[PDB]
Design a protein around this ligand. Structure first.
Ligand SMILES: Nc1ncnc2c1ncn2[C@@H]1O[C@H](COP(=O)(O)OP(=O)(O)OP(=O)(O)O)[C@@H](O)[C@H]1O
Ligand SMILES: Nc1ncnc2c1ncn2[C@@H]1O[C@H](COP(=O)(O)OP(=O)(O)OP(=O)(O)O)[C@@H](O)[C@H]1O
Ligand SMILES: Nc1ncnc2c1ncn2[C@@H]1O[C@H](COP(=O)(O)OP(=O)(O)OP(=O)(O)O)[C@@H](O)[C@H]1O
Ligand SMILES: Nc1ncnc2c1ncn2[C@@H]1O[C@H](COP(=O)(O)OP(=O)(O)O)[C@@H](O)[C@H]1O
Ligand SMILES: [Mg+2]
Ligand SMILES: [Mg+2]
Ligand SMILES: [Mg+2]
Lengths: 752, 449, 172, 58
C-alpha cells in the first residue's frame, strides 16, 4: 500500500511511445481499433499529456502498421513531451479548439545562422500553408529546407494555449533567437523518473506533494488536512536536493527555494525579515511549496546556540511554520544531513510533521540509479549494469554518478591517441567509434570508493590469498565469513539464523594476522576499513568515544564493510585495570565498543575483525559471542606450512632449482612466517651484494648472478634466528588450552 | 504595540515565542536585545497602571526568560500546559475526529489508551496518518494520473479501526524524535529461561502505572530503578529489547558514553535534557546500556577531563532524586562489571533494585536453544536436551553461537551441492545432527570461573 | 557525444611547498577562462551574513563570466567539519559552500579548484561527487621529478659547465 | 598591517611573538589560530611582488 501511488494503471488513454515512420511534427498515428475504442475521428484535434507538466497538440491519423497499444510519433513530438521510446502518455481530444488569430514564434539561434534568406518566407509559409497544423505554447518543431534546417519555438499563442495555424494567421519570426543552451537545459530537467532507489520515499513525498494538489476533494471529503511539512534527511549524496529539483519541476504549485545561509544579513531584524518575506510570497501564490536546503544551517537548537540572531531566526521560523496565524495552502520542505541538530520544536505535527529518510540504496536500487545515469550515455553491448550494481556495495547515487563519469572519461582517455588537443575539431570517425565498454566500467569500479569511507582509506600492499602459505582453514573461514551473508542472504533466511560477524586473530608475532587482513582488503567483495589501535583516542573528554561512534556509523553506511582493528589490545583492555587512564577515558572507549558491536540496535552486515598479540588482557566482554564470536588461533607454521611460506615468498623471485626448500623447512622448526621471509630477504641481499661487486670489478678492468643460489641461502641461514621463544609459545598455547578445556566433553557425539 | 492595546481597551496582548525577545540580560551580549528586555520590563510596569490590558505569553523554554520578567507584577501568573492523560487524550482525539468521517469500527478509547507520550499534536498527526492510510487503501482503485475521482470511491471512503491501528504502529511522540532507535523485534518468547526475572520486570513497570492508589493506601512507594548485573551474554540487553517491544510504555535507550561532550557544561546538560525528555513522555523506561561508563566510582584518578566525569554522575543523582511520585520514569541500568559501579548509584532511592542475570542452568539452556531454533528448520532427531547437559557453563550467547555455527555448516553444504548440481548439468532442507556435531567442536565457554 | 557532464571539482592535497598554488597559477595563466582566486581567511568577516555574501559574490562573478575557474586556497581553514565545529559562522560558511557548489540551481560552466595540506580536515560533504569529486595528490617528487624541478629553477641562473644537476637531484 | 607596510614601501614588517600568533594548525584546537596562520601564509605568498618590503619575526 505504501507504493500504491506509484503503481501504473492500464487505461484506454495510456499507451506506449513508438517511432513514426512518416508522420510529421504536427500529426500522430494511432491504430484504428484504439481510435474506435476512444471514438475519435481521423484528423480530429487531440491533446497529449507529457512528463514534467508538458502538453502537445497533434492531428490523429489511422495507420495499420501502428501497434494497438502505441502511438507512432516522431522525434519532434517526443522532444515536445520530454518522453522517450517505451514511455507512457495519455491522449485526450482537444475541446473547442479555434483557429489562432496571431501566433508569435522564435527560432533557435544555432539554427538561424548560415541562412541569409528570410526565415518566414522560406520555411514557415510553406510549412503552414493549407495545413491547419495545431500548435501549443512553448512547442518546438522542425521544418526541412534551406542550407540548414531551422527549428522554430512558439513563445506566444493567441488564443492561448491551443490554436490552429490557418493560412490567414499572421506568422512573424521577428525577435530574439532562442538560445540553444536554454533548450538543452529545459530538455535536461530532473523529474520523478530521475530518482532511483527511493521508491517508498518518492511515494510518500508524492502523497504529501502531488496527491493534495491533484485531488483536493479527497481530503475535503474525508475531512482532514494533509501533512504540510516534509523533512528529508540522510547521508550526503543520497539525493535530497535531487528530489527537491524533481518536485520543483514536476509540481503545478508555486515553488520557492530557500538556501540555508542566504537568510543571514548584517542589519538587525533583516534575516527574520527575509524569512517573513519568503513565507509571505509563498502565501500570496498559494498553493505553494517552500524548500529550505541545508536546514541545519539556520535551524540549530535554541538551547545550544550562543548567538542571539540565530535563536531569533529559529523562533521566527517556528512562528511562521506554526503560529497564531495559520498557513494557507503552503507546503514547507527541508533537507538536512543531521536531523538531530534541528531544533526539537521544529520536529512535530504542524512543523515538518513527516520525516523522510533518503537512505543508502540496495543492489536493486543502485541498479536503478545506474540505469538512470546511463540513459544518455553511449554504451556497448557487453556492458552489464547488474554486475556493476553488485560490485558497488556502500555506494550512494552520487558515488554511482561518479563511477559513470569516470567510465566515460576512461573511454575518452582510450580515444586520446587519435585526437589532438591543439586541433580545433575532432575527427568524425573518432566521434562515431566512441562508446563505453564493460572494460571502462570495470576500471571505474577499480577506482570506485564510497565517499563516506574518503577519510578512512589506506594503501594496502595488494596481498593475494596465494601470497599466504598455509592457514588453509583460516582462508576458507574468512572467505565464507563475508561471502555467505552477502552473496547468499536467502540461505540464512531459509534456516532462520543470523550470520556470525566477528573474528579475532591471536598468536605469536609474525605468523600472518596482518597478512590475512591485507588479503581480505583485496580479495573479499566488501568495503574495508583499517584502524590502527590508538588512532581513535583523543585528548578531549568526548572525542575518544565519539570517534568510536563515528567509525561504526561509517561502517553501517558502507555495509557490507569489514572493520579490522589492528592491535586490538590497545583499544580494548580490561576495564578498571589501571587508574590514571585519562580519568577513565580508556574504560569508556571499551564501553562504547560494547554497545556498537552488540546493543539496542538492529544488526547490519558489519564484520569486525581483530588481531592481537595478547588476548589475555582483552576485556572478556569483547570476546563474548556476538562480539568477535570466532577466536582463531594463528600458531607458528608447521613443516608443511613452512614449505608453502617459502614457496610463496620465492614465487616471484628467480631461484636456482638446486635449492631445496623442503630441507629449509625441515631445519627450521620454531621459525615464524616473518622469520622465513627474513631468510629469503637475506639471500637476496647477499645476491645483490655479489652482483654489485661483479659490476664494480667489471668496471675496474675498463679503467653475473642471474638467480639466488644455494651459497646465498646457506650464508643467509647462519644469520637466521628464531624470533618466538619457547617461553612465549607457552603463553599462546595456554590461552588455546584454556579455551579447549573450557568446553570439556572431548568430542561431542549424539547418542545412538 | 502597548499603546495600541491601551488605546482600544480592554485589550489582550499575546507575545508568542517570548524567549525570542526575553533572554537573560546578563547572558545577552547584544545591546539592542538588552534594551528590548528593559523596555519590556518598563512596559509591564506601566501596564500595571494601564487600564484593562492583559499580556499573555507562550514559550517552550521558560527557564531562558529573564528572571525579572517572572516577578510579581510582571508575568506573575504562570500556567503550565502539560502532557494530557488518558481522558485528555480521548478528548483531543474526539476533537480531531469530529470533522473526519469514521466507520463504526473505530474505538477512540483504545487509541487514547495506547498513546502514552502524546501531547495532542502527536494525536492530530495520528489522525492525519490514519486518514492518509485510508486514502492509500483506496489508491488501488483511484490513481494519481486521473482527471476525476468516481463518486462511488468518494462514498466508499472512510476511516476504519485498521487505519488507526496502522497509525498507532507508526505513531511515536515527537519528544522522543531525537532518541528513537531501530530495535530488533524481540518477544518475551525469544528469551529462554529467566521466568522469574520476566515476572519481576513486568510487575515493576505495570503496577506503578496501572494501580498508583494502592501504593498510597499501603503507605509504600514503588521502586524507580533496576540494575541488571551479570556475566556477558546472559540476556541483560535482550530483556531491554523485550521491554521496548512488549511493555506498554515509552522507551529511551542510552548508549553509555554518548552523553559526554568535550565542552564545559554540555555533558551535564545532556543528562538534564535526557531525564526531562523521559519525564515529558511518562510512563517511560530510561535504559542505560553499559551503565559503568557514566556511573563509575568517583575519585578513580586525578586526571579527569576537568572533573567532568564526576560532575555527570552528580547530575544523574540530582536528576533521579528530583523525579518521584506521580512521574513514572523507570530507570534500568545494565552493567557488565557491577563492582566498578559507584555505590551512590545503587543506594536506596536510586536504582535500589538489583537483579542478577546468571548463567543459564540446564533447564534454562533447553529454553534458550528452543528459542533460537524456534523459527529454524531442525531435524527431529536433534536432541536439544542432550546439548544442554554437555553445555554445562555455556552462556546464552555461547548457545546461540552453536546454533549459528550449525546453520553455517548447513549453508556450506547446500552451496557446494548447488555448485555440484550446476557442474553435472555442464539438498539440505534442515539442520541435522552432524551440523550440530561439527559446530559443537568449535564451541567454547566465554565466562570463566 | 559520450553524453556525460565533465567533472567540475578539483582538490589538491599535499605537504607544504609541493606546488599546489603553483599549479593553480599555471592553470589560471594557460586556460583562457575567467579565473577568480579565493583565499580562505579573506572571505570571512565579523558581521552576520557577510562571509556567505562574499561567497555568493565570488560565485556569481564566476557565473557571470562563464566559463570560469574558481580556486580556493587553504580550504581547510574556511571549511572545517560542521559536526566538530562549535561556531555558527563556520558551519554556515561550510553550508553556503555546499549549496553554491551543489544545490537546486546547478552551475554548468564553472569549475571550482581547492588546495589544502590536510584533506581529512575538510567537511566530508564537500568531498563527494559534484563538489569535489576528484582529489589530486600533489606529492613529493622522485629523483627525475626533482631533477626537472632543478632544471626549471636553474633556467634563468647562470650555470657553469661544472654544474651537474642530476647529482644534486640524487643528493636531495 | 601588510597594506600599510606596502603603501609605506620600503618598509620592514616586524611581528613580535610570532609563536603566539601562528602555532601549528594540527596542534591547535582553536579555529581562530589556524585562521590567522592561513592568512599569514597568504600574505607572505603575496608579499614577493617587488613591493620592496621585508617581513621579519621574533
Ligand atoms: N536515488 C538517486 N537516483 C538518481 N540519482 C541520484 C540518486 N541519489 C543521488 N543521485 C545523483 O547523485 C547526486 C546527488 O546530489 P544531491 O544534491 O541530490 O545530494 P544530497 O543528498 O542532497 O547531498 P547533500 O546532503 O550534500 O546536500 C546528483 O548528481 C544526483 O543526480
Ligand atoms: N602464513 C604466511 N605466509 C606467508 N608469509 C607470512 C605468513 N605469516 C607471516 N608471513 C610474513 O610475515 C611478515 C609480516 O607478518 P604479519 O604482518 O602478517 O604478522 P602478524 O601476525 O600480524 O604479527 P605482529 O604481531 O608482529 O603484528 C611478511 O613478511 C609475511 O610475508
Ligand atoms: N536467555 C536467552 N534466551 C535467548 N537468547 C539469549 C538468552 N541469553 C542470551 N541470548 C542471546 O545471546 C546474546 C546475548 O546478548 P545480550 O546483549 O543480551 O547480552 P548481555 O547479557 O546484555 O551482555 P553484555 O554485557 O555482553 O552486553 C544475544 O544474541 C541473545 O539473542
Ligand atoms: N612541482 C614543482 N615544480 C617546480 N617548482 C615548484 C614545484 N613545487 C613547488 N615549487 C616551487 O615552490 C614555490 C611555490 O610553492 P607553493 O606551490 O606556493 O607551495 P604550496 O603548495 O604549499 O602552496 C614556487 O616558487 C615554485 O618554484
Ligand atoms: Mg544537497
Ligand atoms: Mg600485525
Ligand atoms: Mg548488553
Amino acid at each position: 500500500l505504501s507504493t500504491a501511488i506509484l503503481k501504473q494503471k492500464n487505461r484506454p488513454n495510456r499507451l506506449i511511445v513508438d517511432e513514426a515512420i512518416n508522420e510529421d511534427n504536427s500529426v500522430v498515428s494511432l491504430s484504428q481499433p484504439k481510435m474506435d475504442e476512444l471514438q475519435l475521428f481521423r484528423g480530429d484535434t487531440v491533446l497529449l499529456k507529457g512528463k514534467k507538466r508538458r502538453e502537445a497538440v497533434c492531428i490523429v491519423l489511422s495507420d495499420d502498421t501502428c501497434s494497438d497499444e502505441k502511438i507512432r510519433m516522431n522525434r519532434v513530438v517526443r522532444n515536445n513531451l520530454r518522453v522517450r521510446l517505451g514511455d507512457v502518455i495519455s491522449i485526450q481530444p482537444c475541446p473547442d479548439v479555434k483557429y489562432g488569430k496571431r501566433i508569435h514564434v522564435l527560432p533557435i539561434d544555432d539554427t538561424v545562422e548560415g541562412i541569409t534568406g528570410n526565415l518566414f518566407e522560406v520555411y514557415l509559409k510553406p510549412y503552414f500553408l493549407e495545413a491547419y497544423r495545431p500548435i501549443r505554447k512553448g512547442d518546438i518543431f522542425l521544418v526541412r529546407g534551406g542550407m540548414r534546417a531551422v527549428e522554430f519555438k512558439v513563445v506566444e499563442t493567441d488564443p492561448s494555449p491551443y490554436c490552429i495555424v490557418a493560412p490567414d494567421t499572421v506568422i512573424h519570426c521577428e525577435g530574439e533567437p532562442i538560445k540553444r543552451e536554454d533548450e538543452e537545459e529545459s530538455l535536461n530537467e530532473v523529474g520523478y523518473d530521475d530518482i532511483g532507489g527511493c521508491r517508498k520515499q518518492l511515494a510518500q513525498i508524492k502523497e504529501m506533494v502531488e496527491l493534495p494538489l491533484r485531488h483536493p476533494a479527497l481530503f475535503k471529503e474525508i475531512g482532514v488536512k494533509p501533512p504540510r511539512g516534509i523533512l528529508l534527511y540522510g547521508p550526503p549524496g543520497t539525493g535530497k536536493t535531487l528530489i527537491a529539483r524533481a518536485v520543483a519541476n514536476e509540481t503545478g504549485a508555486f515553488f520557492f527555494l530557500i538556501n540555508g545561509p542566504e537568510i543571514m544579513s548584517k542589519l538587525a531584524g533583516e534575516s527574520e525579515s527575509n524569512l517573513r518575506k519568503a513565507f509571505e510570497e509563498a502565501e500570496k501564490n498559494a498553493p505553494a511549496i517552500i524548500f529550505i536546503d541545508e536546514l541545519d544551517a539556520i535551524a540549530p537548537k535554541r538551547e545550544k546556540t550562543h548567538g542571539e540572531v540565530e535563536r531569533r531566526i529559529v523562533s521566527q521560523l517556528l512562528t511562521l511554520m506554526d503560529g497564531l496565524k495559520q498557513r494557507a495552502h503552503v507546503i514547507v520542505m527541508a533537507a538536512t544531513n543531521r536531523p538531530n541538530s534541528i531544533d526539537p520544536a521544529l520536529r512535530r505535527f504542524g512543523r515538518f510533521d513527516r520525516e523522510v529518510d533518503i537512505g543508502i540504496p540496495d543492489a536493486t536500487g543502485r541498479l536503478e540509479i545506474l540505469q538512470i545515469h546511463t540513459k544518455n550515455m553511449k554504451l556497448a553491448d557487453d556492458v552489464d549494469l547488474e554486475q556493476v550494481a553488485n560490485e558497488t556495495h556502500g555506494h550512494v547515487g552520487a558515488d554511482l554518478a561518479a563511477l559513470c563519469s569516470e567510465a566515460a572519461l576512461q573511454a575518452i582517455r582510450k580515444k586520446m591517441d587519435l585526437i589532438d588537443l591543439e586541433d580545433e575539431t575532432i575527427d568524425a570517425e573518432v566521434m562515431n567509434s566512441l562508446a563505453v565498454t564493460m572494460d571502462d566500467f570495470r576500471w571505474a569500479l577499480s577506482q570506485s570508493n564510497p565517499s563516506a569511507l574518503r577519510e578512512t582509506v589506506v594503501e594496502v600492499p595488494q596481498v593475494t590469498w596465494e601470497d599466504i602459505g598455509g592457514l588453509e582453514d583460516v582462508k576458507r573461514e574468512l572467505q565464507e565469513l563475508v561471502q555467505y551473508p552477502v552473496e547468499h542472504p536467502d540461505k540464512f533466511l531459509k534456516f532462520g539464523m543470523t550470520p556470525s560477524k566477528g573474528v579475532l586473530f591471536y598468536g605469536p608475532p609474525g605468523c600472518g594476522k596482518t597478512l590475512l587482513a591485507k588479503a581480505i582488503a583485496n580479495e573479499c567483495q566488501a568495503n574495508f576499513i583499517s584502524i590502527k589501535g590508538p588512532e581513535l583516542l583523543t585528548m578531549w573528554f568526548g572525542e575518544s568515544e565519539a570517534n568510536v561512534r563515528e567509525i561504526f556509523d561509517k561502517a553501517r553506511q558502507a555495509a557490507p564493510c569489514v572493520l579490522f582493528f589492528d592491535q586490538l589490545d590497545s583499544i580494548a583492555k580490561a576495564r578498571g585495570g589501571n587508574i590514571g587512564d585519562g580519568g577513565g577515558a580508556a574504560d569508556r572507549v571499551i564501553n562504547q565498543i560494547l554497545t556498537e558491536m552488540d546493543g539496542m540496535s538492529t544488526k547490519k552486515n558489519v564484520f569486525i575483525i581483530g588481531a592481537t598479540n595478547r588476548p589475555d588482557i582483552i576485556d572478556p566482554a569483547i570476546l563474548r559471542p556476538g562480539r568477535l564470536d570466532q577466536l582463531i588461533y594463528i600458531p607458528l607454521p608447521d613443516e608443511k606450512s613452512r614449505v608453502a611460506i617459502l614457496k610463496a615468498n620465492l614465487r616471484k623471485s628467480p631461484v636456482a632449482k638446486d635449492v631445496d626448500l623442503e630441507f629449509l623447512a625441515k631445519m627450521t622448526n620454531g621459525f615464524s612466517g616473518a622469520d622465513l621471509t627474513e631468510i629469503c630477504q637475506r639471500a637476496c641481499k647477499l645476491a645483490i651484494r655479489e652482483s654489485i661487486e661483479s659490476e664494480i670489478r667489471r668496471e675496474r678492468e675498463r679503467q653475473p648472478v642471474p638467480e639466488i643460489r644455494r651459497d646465498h641461502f646457506e650464508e643467509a641461514m647462519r644469520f637466521a634466528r628464531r624470533s618466538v621463544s619457547d617461553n612465549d609459545i607457552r603463553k599462546y598455547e595456554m590461552f588455546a588450552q584454556t579455551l579447549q578445556q573450557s568446553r570439556g566433553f572431548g568430542s561431542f557425539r549424539f547418542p545412538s
